[PDB]
Amino acid sequence: KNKCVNFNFNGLTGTGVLTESNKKFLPFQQFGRDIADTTDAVRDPQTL
Amino acid sequence: GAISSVLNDILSRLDPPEAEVQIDRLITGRLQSLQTYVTQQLIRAAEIR
Numbered sequence: 001k002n003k004c005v006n007f008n009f010n011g012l013t014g015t016g017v018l019t020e021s022n023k024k025f026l027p028f029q030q031f032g033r034d035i036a037d038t039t040d041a042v043r044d045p046q047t048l
Numbered sequence: 049g050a051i052s053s054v055l056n057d058i059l060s061r062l063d064p065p066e067a068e069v070q071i072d073r074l075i076t077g078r079l080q081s082l083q084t085y086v087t088q089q090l091i092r093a094a095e096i097r
Contacts (some may be wrong), residue, residue, distance in 0.1 A: 013056045013060060014056065
């Protein structure tokens with residue numbers, strides 16, 4: 001966490017930092033999107 | 049007119065002999081968006097002058 005690390009979240013390639021989230025997601029929702037329609041959160045394929 | 053809007057998707061699914069066509073449709077479409085934004089802002093700067 002807290003480092004500009006490259007990403008590979010099962011096809012989702014990107015670059016950014018990792019931070020622990022605070023808000024609530026749906027139990028059937030995998031990720032979310034912002035107003036600009038890019039990736040703002042992700043779920044790990046191993047742990048929930 | 050391309051496959052997807054994400055540049056990280058077309059660069060991973062195709063070859064660089066093949067991905068040169070899909071990138072060209074995204075560069076030309078996005079270059080006209082910046083040429084429109086500068087042109088409209090350059091007329092509004094003359095009205096505020």
